[PDB]
Design a protein around this ligand. Structure first.
Ligand code: HEM
Ligand code: HEM
Ligand SMILES: Cc1cc(N)nc(CCc2cc(CCCN(C)C)cc(F)c2F)c1
Ligand SMILES: Cc1cc(N)nc(CCc2cc(CCCN(C)C)cc(F)c2F)c1
Ligand SMILES: C[C@H](O)[C@H](O)[C@H]1CNc2nc(N)[nH]c(=O)c2N1
Ligand SMILES: C[C@H](O)[C@H](O)[C@H]1CNc2nc(N)[nH]c(=O)c2N1
Ligand SMILES: [Zn+2]
Lengths: 407, 411
């Protein structure tokens, strides 16, 4: 019940006391571990609010103080009255920073305290949402000196007036199924690209077309907006040794900005809460470029490298994979766009884990997600035992809006 | 109940019913997942249910469930338990049990081969010398001049826990490690503590970088005894690279036979504390872990130095680049010497086919994603994208404490 995690590369042992404060369920039981599964009223609300305010006033060292008890009473009064409540700006910032702090699948959490929170709870329309998102994108991009940010739209009320960004990420490339049978652009976005066209978009039908925003305010039908191209910082991908690499015609965008998750703070649900940081190189070079269900460029790159692709045991995929990821990192660094390699990021996370175990009693972590998708065991996180549990405030998945929208 | 797993690369969805036959714990609760934790004396009281369940599974598999043979065997095992406090497996049941322990090993990516396992019954063994002979015959048979064959040798089961058979080596073939006074390590740093034991037990150590450790063998709970595996039985492969002529001058080799010897085989409640088993290597076990773990031979720096990679900043991925070349070299060398090896692409693709086949014919395939995904190039192998359910079936291989931590020495 007071659990130990061992690093097998260093024999360092950490004692986890923080998991005792876990709340939500993992999907695992004593009989079955679901560690690798991707997606496992007034009465409920005040306990949730109390739990959150308790940790908030603890964190400002005012637990049990007059202002603590007064705030508890005031929120208790507001819930009994209005059946919901509103967060103080200070509680919103704390809650968002801690939702990131608690994201067990996120390797970049050493940065959790340096998050810019943009309060958009006064937003009422999709044009207003667009304005807030443009400002977010511009602030976060910062001419390539990327800065972590989240923009928080009004919280769910009766579930009929939900704010939603229909895009999975603020910036993503379109996908189109060809008549010739293959897929042009990003195959992961084929369905969303269709819903954009099915709603009015004029697709360039290119290979790297930045999708438009599909913004839903107050439960209304979503609306299309093109992000000003001058706000979308892209990096052409070249290799520091292979001159032919540029001819592949590859590029990626600088800003990873997740926009389809649900932020839960003190029982309140923020269905529209796009957040952004900066890329770890493998997200682009390993997953975006080399997944078979994505841009799937391994064969082409290996061909240009003249590797023996007859036998898998030549490890031509592995060689091509390394070179692609060298190019991504080289390209972003050359254009002075913030990026972190998986070696630096995972070393940071170990440092962060040691920091969290010391100053917080633990750090929930999902090994399946934390270990990078290449070169796993030469990064320190591979040898790090991790305890996965759900702390709140939290980011949660939610259904895709088109499956839900009472049209 | 029914459980679904999804492959996110292919959208294939499979339905697991086999998890309903799970018994042991995982370590996880509704409140905590212990999926990345490495490591999560038995009376007649619990033994006959464990026996009966195993015998039900056995007779079901041979399409004789409820037969007179099945009922007689239950009766015979029952009386043997209450009369003798244990029981003996028939040869057929031991073979079935050992194959199914492998089949049930959720951390093993090589399980497509589970039904082709050579079982050597060593339950008549009584002395460390007898153990040495059986293990030599295992090594010779499994090596097969490089055409490796899977095998397991099963020594007498535990009785009162005071007469255990144990192989003190973690693996039958492993290189020594020696901590130098200056703090550096000669040889395999993983084996330093075991090497010191062997030396203390009288092994004359050559003190090189690739010294095959002696076998340290404990029969019937007696003090363990040192034996040298005949060198002609130890197949080794010098490591060279197909393009880099300087790679051979690194002086690396490895042994061909991966033979785990420290695990416990549980069949029908019986505990076989000494059950060495062997198959063939997946290249990454050597090229990634053995050679490139910081706590092992740790050759990335020297390989990257010889490649003249940019080693000043990690973002050059000089480590990843050297890792691939080292793993090309291991695979090239084993193939060139005609020693069975499998690359991680082939192994993972076969495992997916095996897993799909198990879902169809068996209702599931327990699998530990954390261990199944290879330690390099994770997401370009099909297992990375495969959801997996981990649960414990018996028969099973289990960890047991290291024998030097528990042995009562005779002197
Ligand atoms: C600043 C640098 C950051 C880095 C390097 C980083 C890195 C990563 C990576 C590599 C993943 C794996 C996800 C995938 O492979 O698709 C991830 C997941 C995640 N990140 Fe971070 N991230 C950063 C910033 C942030 C911020 C600012 C937030 C929220 C405020 C956040 C919240 C999350 C969450 C919730 C997940 C998991 C979501 C899911 O399960 O799909 N991250 N991060
Ligand atoms: C024949 C080809 C085989 C291949 C390619 C193979 C491959 C592997 C690999 C790569 C691992 C993880 C090893 C590590 O990282 O330490 C593993 C684990 C395991 N293998 Fe297999 N194996 C094979 C045969 C066998 C056999 C014959 C048995 C038993 C009869 C077996 C039982 C196990 C068990 C019990 C584990 C769990 C290891 C643990 O928890 O420490 N394997 N296998
Ligand atoms: C802020 C930030 C920084 C950074 N470096 N990367 C990212 C992308 C990571 C990511 C991806 C997904 C998609 C999940 C579905 N996908 C598995 C198919 C959902 C997330 F909430 C998430 F954070 C974000
Ligand atoms: C038969 C076979 C084939 C193959 N290819 N490889 C292997 C080695 C795999 C392995 C290793 C370990 C020690 C784990 C050390 N770790 C816990 C720190 C224990 C095992 F039971 C096991 F099977 C075996
Ligand atoms: C902490 C973590 O569980 C540990 O490093 C595991 C990860 N996965 C592994 N996978 C394999 N095949 N072998 C290992 O030794 C490990 N080690
Ligand atoms: C099935 C498996 O859980 C799935 O492929 C996971 C594995 N680990 C991952 N890890 C990260 N960081 N991102 C991912 O999308 C995934 N996918
Ligand atoms: Zn679990």
């Amino acid at each position: 019940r007071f659990l130990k995690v061992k690093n097998w590369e260093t024999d360092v042992v950490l004692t986890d006391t923080l998991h005792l404060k876990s709340t939500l369920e993992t999907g695992c039981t004593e009989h079955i571990c679901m560690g690798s599964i991707m997606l496992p009223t007034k009465d409920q609300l005040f306990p949730l609010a109390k739990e959150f305010l308790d940790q908030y006033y603890s964190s400002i060292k005012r637990f049990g103080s007059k202002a603590h008890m007064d705030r508890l009473e005031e929120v208790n009064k507001e819930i009994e009255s209005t059946s919901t409540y509103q967060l103080k700006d200070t509680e919103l910032i704390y809650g968002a920073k801690h939702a990131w702090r608690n994201a067990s699948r996120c390797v970049g959490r050493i940065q959790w305290s340096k998050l810019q929170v943009f309060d958009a709870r006064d937003c009422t329309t999709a044009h207003g949402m667009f304005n807030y998102i443009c400002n977010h994108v511009k602030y976060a991009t910062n001419k390539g000196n990327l800065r972590s940010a989240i923009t928080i739209f009004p919280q769910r009320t009766d579930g009929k007036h939900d704010f939603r960004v229909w895009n999975s990420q603020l910036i993503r490339y379109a996908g189109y199924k060809q008549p010739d049978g293959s897929t042009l652009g990003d195959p992961a976005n084929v369905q969303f690209t269709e819903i954009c066209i099915q709603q009015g978009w004029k697709a360039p039908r290119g290979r790297f077309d930045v999708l438009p925003l599909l913004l839903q305010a107050n439960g209304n039908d979503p609306e299309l907006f093109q992000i000003p191209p001058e706000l979308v910082l892209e990096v052409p991908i070249r290799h520091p040794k292979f001159d032919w690499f540029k001819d592949l015609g590859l590029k990626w965008y600088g800003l990873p900005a997740v926009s389809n998750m649900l932020l839960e703070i003190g029982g309140l649900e923020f269905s529209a809460c796009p957040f952004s940081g900066w890329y770890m190189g493998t997200e682009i070079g390993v997953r975006d470029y080399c997944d078979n269900s994505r841009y799937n460029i391994l064969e082409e790159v290996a061909k240009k490298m003249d590797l023996d692709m007859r036998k898998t045991s030549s490890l031509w995929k592995d060689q091509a994979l390394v070179e692609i990821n060298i190019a991504v990192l080289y390209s972003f660094q050359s254009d002075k766009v913030t990026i972190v390699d998986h070696h630096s990021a995972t070393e940071s996370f170990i440092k962060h884990m040691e920091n969290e175990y010391r100053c917080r009693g633990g750090c929930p972590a999902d090994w399946v997600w934390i270990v990078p998708p290449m070169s796993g065991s030469i990064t320190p996180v591979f040898h790090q035992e991790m305890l996965n549990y759900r702390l709140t405030p939290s980011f949660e998945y939610q259904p895709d809006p088109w499956n839900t929208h009472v049209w």
